[PDB]
Amino acid sequence: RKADLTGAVSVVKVDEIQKQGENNPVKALQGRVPGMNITADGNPSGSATVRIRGIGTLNNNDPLYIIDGVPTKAGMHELNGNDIESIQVLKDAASASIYGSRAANGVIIITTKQGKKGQIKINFDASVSASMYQSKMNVLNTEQYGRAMWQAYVNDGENPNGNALGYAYNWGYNADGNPVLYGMTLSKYLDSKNTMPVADTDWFDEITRTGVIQQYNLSVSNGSEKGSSFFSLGYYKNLGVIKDTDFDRFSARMNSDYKLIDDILTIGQHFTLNRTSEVQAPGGIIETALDIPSAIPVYASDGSWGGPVGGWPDRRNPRAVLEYNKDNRYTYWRMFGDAYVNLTPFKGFNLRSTFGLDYANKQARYFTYPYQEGTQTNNGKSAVEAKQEHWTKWMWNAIATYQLEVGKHRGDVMIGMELNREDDSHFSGYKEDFSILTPDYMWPDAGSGTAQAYGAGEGYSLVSFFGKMNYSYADRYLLSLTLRRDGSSRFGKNHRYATFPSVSLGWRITQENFMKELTWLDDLKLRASWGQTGNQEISNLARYTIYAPNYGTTDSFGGQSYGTAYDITGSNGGGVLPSGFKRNQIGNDNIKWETTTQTNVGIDFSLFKQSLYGSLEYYYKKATDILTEMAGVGVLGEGGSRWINSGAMKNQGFEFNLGYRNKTAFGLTYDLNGNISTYRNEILELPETVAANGKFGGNGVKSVVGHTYGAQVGYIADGIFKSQDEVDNHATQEGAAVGRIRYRDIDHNGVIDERDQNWIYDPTPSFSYGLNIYLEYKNFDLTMFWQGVQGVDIISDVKKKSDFWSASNVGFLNKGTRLLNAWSPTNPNSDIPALTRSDTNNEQRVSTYFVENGSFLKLRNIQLGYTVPAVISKKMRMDRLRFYCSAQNLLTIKSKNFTGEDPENPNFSYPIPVNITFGLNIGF
Amino acid sequence: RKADLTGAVSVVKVDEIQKQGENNPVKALQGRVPGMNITADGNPSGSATVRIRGIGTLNNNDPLYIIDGVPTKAGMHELNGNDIESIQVLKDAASASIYGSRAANGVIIITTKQGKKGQIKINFDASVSASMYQSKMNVLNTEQYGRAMWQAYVNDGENPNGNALGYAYNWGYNADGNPVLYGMTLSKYLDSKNTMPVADTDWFDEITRTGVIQQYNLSVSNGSEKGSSFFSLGYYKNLGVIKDTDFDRFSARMNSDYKLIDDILTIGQHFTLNRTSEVQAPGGIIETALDIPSAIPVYASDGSWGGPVGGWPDRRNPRAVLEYNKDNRYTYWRMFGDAYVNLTPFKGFNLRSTFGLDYANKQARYFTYPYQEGTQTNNGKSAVEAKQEHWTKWMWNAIATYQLEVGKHRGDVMIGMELNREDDSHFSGYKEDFSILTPDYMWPDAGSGTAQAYGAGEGYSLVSFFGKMNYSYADRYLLSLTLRRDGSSRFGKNHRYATFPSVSLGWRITQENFMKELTWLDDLKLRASWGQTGNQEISNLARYTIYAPNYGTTDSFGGQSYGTAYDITGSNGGGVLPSGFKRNQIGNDNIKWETTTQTNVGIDFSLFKQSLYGSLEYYYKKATDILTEMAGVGVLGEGGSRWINSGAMKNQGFEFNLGYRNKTAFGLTYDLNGNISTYRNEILELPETVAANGKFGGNGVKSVVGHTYGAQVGYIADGIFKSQDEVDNHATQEGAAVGRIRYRDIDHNGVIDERDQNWIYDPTPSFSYGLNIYLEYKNFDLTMFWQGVQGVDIISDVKKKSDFWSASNVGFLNKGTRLLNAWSPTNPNSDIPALTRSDTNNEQRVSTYFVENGSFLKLRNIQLGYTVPAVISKKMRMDRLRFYCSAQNLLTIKSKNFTGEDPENPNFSYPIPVNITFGLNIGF
Ligand SMILES: OC[C@H]1O[C@@](CO)(OC[C@H]2O[C@@](CO)(OC[C@H]3O[C@@](CO)(OC[C@H]4O[C@](O)(CO)[C@@H](O)[C@@H]4O)[C@@H](O)[C@@H]3O)[C@@H](O)[C@@H]2O)[C@@H](O)[C@@H]1O
Ligand SMILES: OC[C@H]1O[C@@](CO)(OC[C@H]2O[C@@](CO)(OC[C@H]3O[C@@](CO)(OC[C@H]4O[C@](O)(CO)[C@@H](O)[C@@H]4O)[C@@H](O)[C@@H]3O)[C@@H](O)[C@@H]2O)[C@@H](O)[C@@H]1O
Ligand SMILES: [Mg+2]
């Protein structure tokens, strides 16, 4: 039963959601909803990014979740997802407008479990899983690194023995004169102090482990003709594949409802309290592991952490970084409550008053230990940073609803007044100069150095007056009209309030009397909708010209702190310097709501007595007056960025969902749920400065207007040179040589320059599809979910560090294994450019070489279960006893054009492991 | 129904508790429990101090509250007290031992409301009250202040015109030569700059107001044969009589229980969430208001805050202090949850597993605004202090219980394992040098001065193995035996665990067959108990020799920060000085549990068919091996304090409770509940250093061993001198003169010195009593509660500032009105010493003059209510509709020997106002 019945609403089967055994319920439905993309890195937490109906605005695109009627935007990884009874995604503006003023990016409606009338249920779910690291990037070992360095040296024509890295090469020339390597030897110690012995270290294996996931849920549900209740407890723990990274969560939910008199005075509440403790991986840990050469030992001769010495590249020890980061644990208390009262003066009138609260409290204590890894050190700096953050949101809602059933005319009239009110704050203390260097001793009182205090606060409010009218004739013609008047504190008084209408029409064709002979066609419905929604998800301080006293106490990398503190006297400090103010942004009093107009046309069908069901949707979204933060013109200086309504986005999309469930003669019940979706995104208008800086695409070379959001312009790589004749015949370019990348001459001017660039990257897949298969046979249930993406291109940064030598900022870094298969006179059958120590050709430029085909098809979740026969369970007094074994991310298929691995995560983000899970469910 | 039936247990009628309409339920039963003293200052919060059975130890004496089986020690002012169904105070060690290892100071058992089986109830309570400031200290006005100063000047023989305060006196001599004042005049401006005009300011009226108290509670309760639930919402707000001080609290409680199978698997939970926001009064605000003379105007000529100028005494403006303190608001989130599961393998066996959690989160932001009140200033210092505190306690409990009913023998055997685990932390950031000077702008990021970071953490754990055996023969002979094995993390491994036994006997004399002819004697029971309990409420870091790197970043008054930072180079600072460590305390590995042995004998009676009931109890408490923090010997230096088991306290007490309820011929139902209690406290052993410093009594002159806790030694004032002959005849003393205090010569050596001191102060009342009267007549219910204390002495500090002139640290301060009635040749009929500007006689010394009789009898609460007749309520569908008007602290009677006012609060603490409340209860 859809909550709108006349809009683009997707109902997710919650039973299949819990099968995947994911902490985040949103991550579970990664590819089960058409036109809704979920991207998850693979960290122990269930944090993921959601994009509904593509990219719809130049602002925050997270959809508005609704739990028990209370809206929010925080991720669901911090809430217990095992007590959800229904999930509905409202991807249509007309249908989702009535649920809030933040519905521009879509609304996901989540309903929690409630006690079923007249019965009691208890469910205990246990789950133990092992997560294994699968996407192991192949990097050069010691011998391979030496061979690659020798190849680069001989290709450049330099002496390979001058590497000054302890490698001594015995080599010569063949009959054709091409250099050949006979053998290599290494010095025992990398430094003259004999403190860093040479070793063959697998850094990826050193920093990875086999994670353990535990999940225990216990829920009890109570129903009656007269009231109901529900109490759930949950514990989740996930150890990541990366060492010293973990995430655990305790959860307790209590829901209840009471009916007084006979039917009047229905008072209900839903509350949940969660406590999540997490240690996250340091930024660029995978990059650090990939960059550091395998010759560096984990431990030095004296037992301290190993590190680069002499001429080895400056990279920290990833194991040491993980060890020092294991104490950066943060605790997060989440609190989602709601209490509502419903009054019924007579049969058709309802008055609902609702109060919802969301309180979040985050406490963290970060430590900075002194480290000395060879030549890598922080000058013995030890510090503590105690940070506290508070978020407090509350919403009050009043709803008046009237229903009439006059003849064949059904009429629902609803009005509503809503207030939303959010306040955020944070403050932190910073201390230095510690002695014991242990988390027990590192407290700000125990410090003996410079101290810093940081602190800020913000907030906003929203007011909404909405109305909804639904008319039904003969249960065949449906009309819906909703109107919203929304105001926010982020806008000035003149442009505070805005009006948004939406209309929906629906015709149940099967109800018409002219096709009663079509017995096979069980149900057919055609619906259309045209709606407008408002977007105001911008910075709270958007219309003010901000001047802030930035003294410079905040840590900055590179010294570009832009602080306001100058030693005007010239005494080299020694006290409190005079300070001032700096401009952060220029105010704009003409900012108003961004208007997103959505037109949707859908056809729902069901054939063969509800056996073959499905839906087909086509949508057109047009966002105008987009509140974008334009940067300064360049001579406007600091604080030149300002918010302006100068945007325009278009999204044209198709979605198709199908489902076929049927039994078999010998007792097999098969259910197939297929889904496919495609969309095209375009930017029609954009501010000149925004298009110039290329923050939304174009790389600052060409304007992204008229092209897909995020599209990138680069050169075109027409293979590599294989002879001097090819270099001479090709158009002249700097650094052209044998074995170097050849770049196409777009304008045919005879010279390769910055004007020889074109659109090369389009981050829009041709189509994304999913398929769920459920088989039941003799108490055996098998679930198999496949997700595929076709026609998507990806920019690969790992390729830049695997197909080239000395293509990074610093040289002598560790590279990929496939680098060994580079072009050479001895090995002409290769497309990888020849190794070189100098990037004369400038191959780090954006080009089609780094663009790879990201199409993939992976088995997201497979599960085989066994249900104990009812007689044995009744003997053991359990109403339902089930066991199951599942595999998540077990298998994947990728295109041959993708040189790397894991097309879903082709970069240095958190890896996605393979989960092998065993679980049991008891229904006492 | 008592939960022990064989110990000293007092059951408090919760219905009478809610009548007083107090936020703190503990404050409501201030004098309704024998042998239990409640002291409340009168602040908007319900915070109060509880002492059960007198002072029982030299450590923290707060009793252990128990809510829904979870123990705690936090005050109940931060929890909703309107959803309590039963309150039981266990004042006996034997009865309260089984409830925890922290039962040395008594256990208060609080049970929350739960849904009554087979029915639904909703109650809505509204209450609006006005609090009026009654204890207005009478201080001298401008003319009275001038007259008093002139009298002091003429008594001292000096020229009254040299006061240099703008007072010009026209005066002369009478026939007898005694000075007489004819008139006085004042300069218009107190300073030569004409910025502080003279005025007659009533500072007490200026800083006080009429407070408004609002209370709104809404509870719903759900019962069934098969499960139950309860949901309560509450809002409280109290504006104190002192301006810019307030306290509000939101509360939400959800309780539920579910029964599975038939009777096995009973799963229940009780959760409550509270949010209290409070602004407290600054320290010594009443003292500041009393000290500042009335001549100082509230506002200056330019509109700024008025302040002392010229020779006026240095005192801040209390109104300015309150105005600057109005932004020091702290928010406190309290979280008390519990979840339990009960299993019944068969009829007599029960297994209960309980998990309780208490999470408290306090966030505060204090501001230091620059002030310039005449000559009072802070050199334009502006600062912000953002403080965060976290408390997290959790308890796990396992209980196995077996019951047997063999013939007339009833046997209960219970064993239990309990773990308690508490962790506390706090951290704060400090910033300076602000410009706008508003709470919106004062954030640590906006500061431009020196920053400080403070932070600390601590915690402890408790393990308990307890057993309880109850045997009943013929329902006439009762025996109870409990044994506890308790260990704490605050002790070393050798002395970690301790064993505590307790035994209880009971005989129902009325059940014997030899007195069946005594029909009037309905019930009679005689019980005895001997128990031992353990006390370990000490500092967590008690056995460790503490060395801390106190750099000195903490603010200190007077400069005695004892910081560790020295400019060893001699450059007047300019950087980070070298630091070190200092000793905080000396460890003691021999510390163990403090053993409190309690012997109780009680007689319970009920006569005339449960019409005249009552109880009489006698108790003897002996605490030995008391963990006391002895100070250093004096040459041991800093950190010489250490914890040692060298204490011994004795408490001998009597309690008597009586109750008589009966109807009348014409339809009047009268119920009287009287209570009386008395106790004597003594200290038998004490460390030599502790007795020398006199922290527990004696004022450092004589050892408190063998005397009451808190007893004070001082001189004896034998009136005042009235002639030179009296001075000559009396023993010689320094400063002796006409009109000065005469001090008794205790040792008869002819000279008054420091050896002429004796025990003068004993802080133990002769007896404390209470009386509750409840009258019902024709839908009119009248409640009247009186509380009286007799035989208590109080040290008065207000008297020192009201009966003497220039008796404070600084001169020319404002004094009390009764100072005008001082002894003089013109007014010989007075006992107040003559005014003087020099304290030559040293009348500030501790003496019997400042000891006053604190006996009082006050009407704590009176309430008149009207209940709507049942027919009208049934017409309006309400099951019960009631209105009421009440007065709290309306009337009091004090002894004539008490010169001041409000004997309950005879000092500069928060005043106790008179509350006039109107409330309604609806039982829809
Ligand atoms: O991130 C910018 C923006 O986020 C806000 C608004 O909620 O708060 C986020 C703060 O969290 C910070 C570090 O403290 O990073 C986010 C990490 O903290 C976690 C903890 O669960 O997330 C917290 C917060 O972000 C979501 O996860 C986003 O959906 C929400 O579910 C949740 O409420 C964790 O998920 C992240 O790793 C940092 O970004 C912010 O201080 C604002 O404070 C801030 O403006
Ligand atoms: O007071 C010393 C001792 O108290 C602890 C242990 O709980 O925490 C008290 C902290 O609160 C401080 C200021 O932050 O003063 C107490 C004021 O805060 C309130 C807020 O409700 O009380 C908090 C805390 O103290 C009780 O009230 C005592 O019964 C408890 O009910 C409640 O848990 C308020 O009542 C007081 O005005 C300060 O004393 C402490 O930082 C320890 O932290 C500390 O060692
Ligand atoms: Mg060209």
Ligand SMILES: [Mg+2]
């Ligand atoms: Mg003497």
